[PDB]
């Protein structure tokens, strides 16, 4: 003998959670994929002494490619 369980409407909370997850993932999955691709294929810079008679650009003092960009 199954009975009816009286509950408050859970449709709207579930819809809000689904929408928030959808938008966050929509904007974040490309970001994570791009970060992973950049890390794998464009590694961090390597420390090196400044060659004689050469001045580096202002963005050539950082090691992460995203930070340099």
């Amino acid at each position: 003998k199954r009975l009816f369980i009286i509950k408050p409407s859970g449709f709207y909370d579930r819809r809000f959670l689904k929408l928030m997850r959808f938008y966050i993932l929509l904007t974040g999955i490309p970001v994570a994929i791009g970060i992973t691709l950049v890390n794998v294929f464009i590694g961090e810079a390597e420390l090196a002494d400044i060659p004689e008679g050469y001045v580096p650009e202002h963005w050539e003092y950082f090691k992460h490619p995203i930070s340099r960009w």
Binding site: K1, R2, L3, F4
Partner: protein, 36 residues
């Protein structure tokens, strides 16, 4: 020293209504229909 006749009648009517409502709370064999 016990239920008065008015109290007896009111309790009987309320009990009948309550039992009818509780019976109505039951589920038909198909009630949880699922969307495709």
């Amino acid at each position: 020293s016990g239920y008065t006749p008015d109290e007896k009648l009111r309790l009987q009517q309320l009990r009948e209504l309550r039992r009818r409502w509780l019976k109505d709370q039951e589920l038909s064999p198909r009630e949880p229909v699922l969307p495709p």
